[PDB]
């Protein structure tokens with residue numbers, strides 16, 4: 657679930673402001689996205705959007721009727737270490753990892769204020 661995603665990011669990147677920070681960033685961090693990613697971070701989101709694309713096409717998520725951001729799952733945090741609990745079932749585990757990997761990715765990609773609120777129509 658999205659709330660869990662924001663929570664997950666706040667775990668891997670402490671003083672973070674997930675939504676303020678990762679929405680409308682680059683050409684992929686946000687609703688949808690196209691064009692060439694603008695940097696390592698924008699790439700993290702491209703990967704995340706593909707992971708969510710596979711998720712819906714996953715047999716294990718056949719009963720999930722909406723966007724993966726509505727799929728709730730089970731994760732824990734410890735020392736900015738994100739764990740996807742084994743109690744998660746197929747679809748959840750999967751979606752949990754799309755998120756986890758994204759948080760980790762986000763925490764290791766440079767952040768360039770210039771790529772925030774980028775003009776998509778003009779550069780994507």
Ligand SMILES: CCCCCCCCOS(=O)(=O)[O-]
Pocket residue numbers: 658659660679687
């Ligand atoms: C352009 C941003 C769209 C998504 C905004 C946040 C939607 C979810 O809000 S939440 O259910 O408390 O995690």
Ligand SMILES: [Ca+2]
Pocket residue numbers: 684685686687688689701705
């Ligand atoms: Ca996106």
Ligand SMILES: [Cl-]
Pocket residue numbers: 684685686687701704705
């Ligand atoms: Cl995204």
